[PDB]
Structures are given as C-alpha cells and as structure tokens.
Amino acid sequence: SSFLHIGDIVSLYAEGSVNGFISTLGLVDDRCVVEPAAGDLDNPPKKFRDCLFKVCPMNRYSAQKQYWKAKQTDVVLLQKLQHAAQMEQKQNDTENKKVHGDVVKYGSVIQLLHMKSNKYLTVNKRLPALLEKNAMRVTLDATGNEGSWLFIQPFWKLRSNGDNVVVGDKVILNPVNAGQPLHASNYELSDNAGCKEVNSVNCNTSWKINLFMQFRDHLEEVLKGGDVVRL
C-alpha cells in the first residue's frame, strides 16, 4: 500500500450504474466512455494503455481564456495577451515541476491527463451531454481550461478532508465549476457498441484508483512496462 502522489500514472475503475474502466474512442474523438465488457480488475482490458491517466496539479488559465475571448471577438493588445498566455503556461509548467511528487490530500484540486492522447479531462457546464440531456458534457481538451479542475473527495466515511489519498481507494471526482460528480451513465453509444457514456450529474458513482506507475519510476532512462520498443 502507498499514498497517491502528483505525477503517478493511475487507472480509474468505475463502480456505479455500470462497472468498468474509463477509456477513450481515439485521438480524433473527444468522448470519454466506459466499456464493462472490456475487462475488470482481475482481467484488465487488453488495450490497457488507453485507460491510463496522470495526476497533475492545478493550472491557471486566466490569461489563456482572455486571449481566447480576444480571438473570438488591437494588434498590440493581442500581442500582449499572447505573451501573457505564454508566460502563464511557462509558470504553470514550472509550478508542476516544482510540486512534482507531492502527496495528494482529500479536498485538493487535480487534473487527469489522458496520456495516449496527451489531453486533460474537462467538464463543460455550458453544454449538455450528447445522450443524457439532463447531465453536463465531459470531453478531452489538449490545452485544458478551468473545467479540468476536479476535487478528489472521499467516498468512504472513514476518510476525511485533509487525509492523504491511499492507492486502491474509492473516491469521487467532482468538477469545481460544474459541481456535479462524474457519472458513468447506462446510455450506450449508437456508433460504438458496448461503450457507455461518462457525464457530469448527481449520482453515487465511485472511482477506484489503481496504481500503474510511480512518479519516481516514471523517468525516461529506464525500461518500463508499457513502453513501445523495437527489437
């Protein structure tokens, strides 16, 4: 047993309306789905590299959002906004590197970076879910925004805010802005058989965190499981 740390590669197993891991349909589709028939904890899915996420700290997107709004709706102002956004990105990278390896405590804010697509998981409160119209949409964004902020809350009464998160625990991923925890709905996609939607709505869904790789072991100088190599 071990505590969860920033930079660790983990997988999330849903135990709600449906049971299974959370995966993606590809690098061109921004829909997150759960496939119960793919596998379970004892028999993980064969394409398990699609179910891996990296725990990341909070990121700032104020300058980026201002620049995006400016683009949507002068040259000097745009140049200054672009420079501010670049500086904010550099500062976020520096802060992430500084806080790399820190322990994760309940009630903190984290971001889930799907590694295969290198995309942060985001919740959009301004758009309903494609299938569950009463829910809110969940997608993957390369740059990310404030919708990627997720409180990690204790699902068990024996865990309290401020306590360190232990590997193998079941937690609740609550978007900061949307306010409705991630839910693995029972609706099935009409194009991908066996895949269930992931949205944001009130529910009792829990996510079990299974450790795949430690932050210390996640270094690009050693042979590691899941690495693609040529013989």
Binding site: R126, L127, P128, K133, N134
Partner: protein, 463 residues
C-alpha cells in the same frame, strides 16, 4: 406581583408597511416613557394633519401657481421655532425638563429603561425628518370605496406577511387562506386602466412586492402539487404589478437575480418586467441572455425563452443593436439543440408531416410554434440594416429551403409569413449586396406564389 408583559415595540417609528431591587420604580418609569412615546406619536399625527389641511387650503384657493414660500413658512413654524407650536410642547421649559429626564434615565441600571431613554433622546432631535418621512408615507384617498380597498388590502398583506414569516408549519390550515388571499388580490388589483394605475401606485407605496418576493423565496420541496398553485398566483400578481408601470418594472428588476432559475413561470415574469422598457432592454447585461440561451440548450426547447428574447430586442419601437448582435452570436454558437432547422430532405419531410396536422391551427407550445418563433426571432435580429447578423443568419436558412417550404402546396400561413419576413429582413433589406437574391431564379418563384395567393384571396372573398 409583577407581570413584565411587553407588547409590540413602543419606541418604533410608525410606518405604512408595519432582578433589580427597585424593579417597581424601573417599570413605572418605563411605562411613563411608553406613554410619552404614544403622546409624541399623537403629536406627529396632528402635525401631519395640519400639513394636509394647509395643503388642501392652498389647493382649493389656487384651483377653485402655489405659494410654496408660504407653505414652507407654515411648515417650518410648527417645529418649536416660534410660539405658534408652543402648546404642542410636552414641557413648560422648552423641552429642558424632558431632555434632563431622558439624560438622567439613561444613567440607570435597567437596560430596557436606558434603551427607551436613548430612543426618545434620538427622536427628540429628529422631529422634522420623522415628520417629512411620515408625510411622504401618507396616502390620500377620495372615496370611501378607496378607503375600504386600502383597509382590505392592508389586512390581507399583513396576514400573508405573518404567514410567510412563519412558513414552517405548511412547507393544512395555512394553504386555503394563502390561496384565497392571493386570488382575491389578483382579482381586485386589475380593473380598467385608471383603477389599474391607482392600484399599482398604492401597492408600490405599501410594498406588496416585498412580501410577494418573500413568498417566492421560501424553501420548498421539489414536488408539492398544492403550493404550486400558490406560486402560480404569486407570479400572476407580479405580472399584473408591472403592466405599464416602468417604476414597478425597475423595482422588480432590482431583484432580477431571484427570477434567474430554471422555470417557465419566471420567464413570463421576466418578459413582463422587460416589456416595452427601453431603459432596461438597452442596458440588459450579458448574464441574462446567457442564462436564457443555456436554458434553451440544456433544459429544453420552449417558446417562453424565445418570447423573452424577442421582446428584449425591440422596446418602444426602437431596436437594440447590442441585443440583436449578442442574441444572434449566442444562438449560432449552439446548434441542433437550440437553433433547429429543417433543410435536409428528411427534415423537410418530417416538417411537412407534422404541419399537415396543423391544418386547423398551429397547436400552442408545439415544435412548429417553436420553429416559427425561432424564425421570427432571427428575422427580428436583422431588422436594423445590420451587416453581421444578416450575413450570419443567411447561412442558417438558405434561400433554397425558404422557397421549397413556401411554394409547397401543404404550407400554412404562419410558416409562410415567417419565411417571407426572414427573406425580406435578412436577404432583401440589407446594406450589402447578395449574389443569390438577384443572380438566381428563386425570388421569382416566390413572386409567382404571391400572385397565386392574391388570386386565392380574391376567390375566397368572392365566396
């Protein structure tokens, strides 16, 4: 033998919208202070009556301008400056004894006695302000019917306010009375136009809207099926409280954040608040339109939000360019859930199938009604010779779809009017040239259909 029975706060300014060993001595002094406060209230009433009498005298002698100088002199002469108000003084030393008594009582252990002494001391040096406030609160009536209406309205408002302040026992005997009070108020408030204006002014003076909003603010369960009617009548009361009254509209707009909740009844109240009020339509903030568009997208497709958006665009005839541009920009961003159009062959077939059932009249709240309202809103967003909204909406509804839906035999007058208005405001009446309108054989088919419609009108009238 000592009963410390405390009634309503004696040392409270009148308003239209209403252990110690020497305990015996302390209570006697407190009761004397209460009596003095009552006498001061009576004196205030007498001063108000004197002001009303002098105003009536001036009015009758001027209208069988007005001498505001003499009015002010008489109004100032009653506040102890001269001997004219000497008899109104409650002391034989020009208030010295009263002030000394208040100061002496302020230095006593008895906390309520000190509080009353301080209240009287502060009221002593604020006679003019209190008199002006009371005179402002005064209501003038001409008929015993008006007096009876005032009395019944005041009693009903007091009972409803008392129930709302204790709305914990019914959120069975507190439902019938509340619904009856709301129904009676709604029935009585609206009569003609002059009586309507008088009732609106009286209700604004007595602050009924405050109690009405407090009735809505009460926490409640999702499903009751009984207090829903109470809220339905409460919203109707507010809707009637705004008709042709920009002052009431602004007063209820000051509390607009209460109506920014998912619901259909609140949409009607917002529409009535913003109806024919340019000062509010032109200054409407972004979040209101954002919230309405979000409700259209997520909650569902309903005609109330479209009606609100349409009424906000134009106020007092003049169109609001900012509202047009913002509404178009926010509507075009969301598609297939808010801006639904039937341009594909299958969508057109579905439109014809659903419209064939509207031969005897379009059903209210129906998807066809929603589509008509959406088309009308898009057309109205471009009725200002704008260059942005027109080109933005030209793509949503191509002229080919317009002509196809207009020339079809099974097409109804409502949709025909909507499409013709759209192709007039968004295509023809534009400040920039459009290739499709003129360098294409589309508008000529519409002209032929217009001639056919004229012939149909001729035949129908002859029949």
């Amino acid at each position: 033998t000592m009963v410390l029975s405390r009634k309503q706060s004696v040392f409270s300014a009148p308003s239209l919208s209403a252990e110690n060993e020497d305990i015996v001595v302390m209570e006697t002094k407190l009761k004397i202070l209460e009596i003095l406060q009552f006498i001061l209230n009576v004196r205030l009433d007498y001063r108000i009556s004197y002001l009303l009498s002098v105003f009536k005298k001036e009015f009758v002698e001027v209208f069988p301008n007005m001498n505001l100088d003499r009015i002010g002199e008489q109004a100032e002469a009653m506040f102890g400056v001269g001997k004219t108000s000497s008899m109104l003084e409650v002391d034989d030393e020009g208030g010295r004894m009263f002030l000394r008594v208040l100061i002496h009582l302020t230095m006593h252990d008895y906390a309520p006695l000190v509080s009353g002494a301080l209240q009287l001391l502060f009221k002593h040096f604020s006679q003019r302000q209190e008199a002006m406030h009371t005179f402002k609160q005064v209501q003038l009536l001409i008929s015993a019917q008006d007096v009876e209406n005032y009395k019944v309205i005041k009693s009903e408002l007091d009972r409803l306010r008392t129930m709302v302040e204790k709305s914990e026992l019914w959120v069975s005997e507190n439902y019938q009375i509340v619904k009856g009070i709301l129904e009676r108020l709604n029935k009585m408030c609206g009569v003609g136009e002059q009586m309507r204006k008088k009732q609106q002014r009286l209700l604004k003076n007595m602050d009924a809207h405050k109690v009405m909003l407090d009735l809505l603010q009460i926490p409640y369960d999702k499903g009751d099926a009984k207090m829903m009617e109470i809220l339905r009548y409460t919203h109707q009361f507010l809707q009637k409280f705004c008709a042709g009254n920009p002052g009431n509209q602004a007063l209820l707009h000051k509390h607009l954040h209460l109506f920014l909740t998912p619901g259909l009844l609140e949409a009607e109240t917002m529409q009535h608040i913003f109806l024919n009020n340019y000062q509010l339509c032109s200054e409407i903030s972004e979040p209101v339109l954002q919230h309405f568009v979000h409700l259209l997208a997520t909650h569902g497709r309903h005609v109330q939000y479209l009606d609100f958006l349409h009424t906000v665009i134009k106020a007092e005839g003049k169109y609001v360019k900012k509202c047009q541009d913002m509404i178009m920009t926010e509507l075009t961003n969301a598609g297939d859930d808010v801006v639904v159009f039937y341009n594909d062959k299958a969508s057109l077939a579905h439109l014809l199938d659903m419209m064939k059932a509207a031969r005897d009249g379009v059903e209210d709240h129906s998807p066809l009604m929603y589509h008509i309202s959406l088309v009308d809103l898009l057309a109205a967003c471009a009725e200002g010779k704008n260059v942005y909204t027109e080109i933005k909406c030209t793509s949503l509804l191509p002229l080919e779809d317009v002509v196809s839906v207009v020339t079809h035999e099974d097409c109804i007058t409502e949709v025909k009017m909507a499409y013709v208005n759209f192709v007039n405001h968004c295509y023809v009446d534009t400040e920039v040239e459009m290739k499709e309108i003129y360098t294409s054989n589309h508008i000529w088919t519409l002209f032929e259909n217009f001639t056919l419609d004229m012939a149909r009108v001729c035949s129908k009238r002859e029949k």
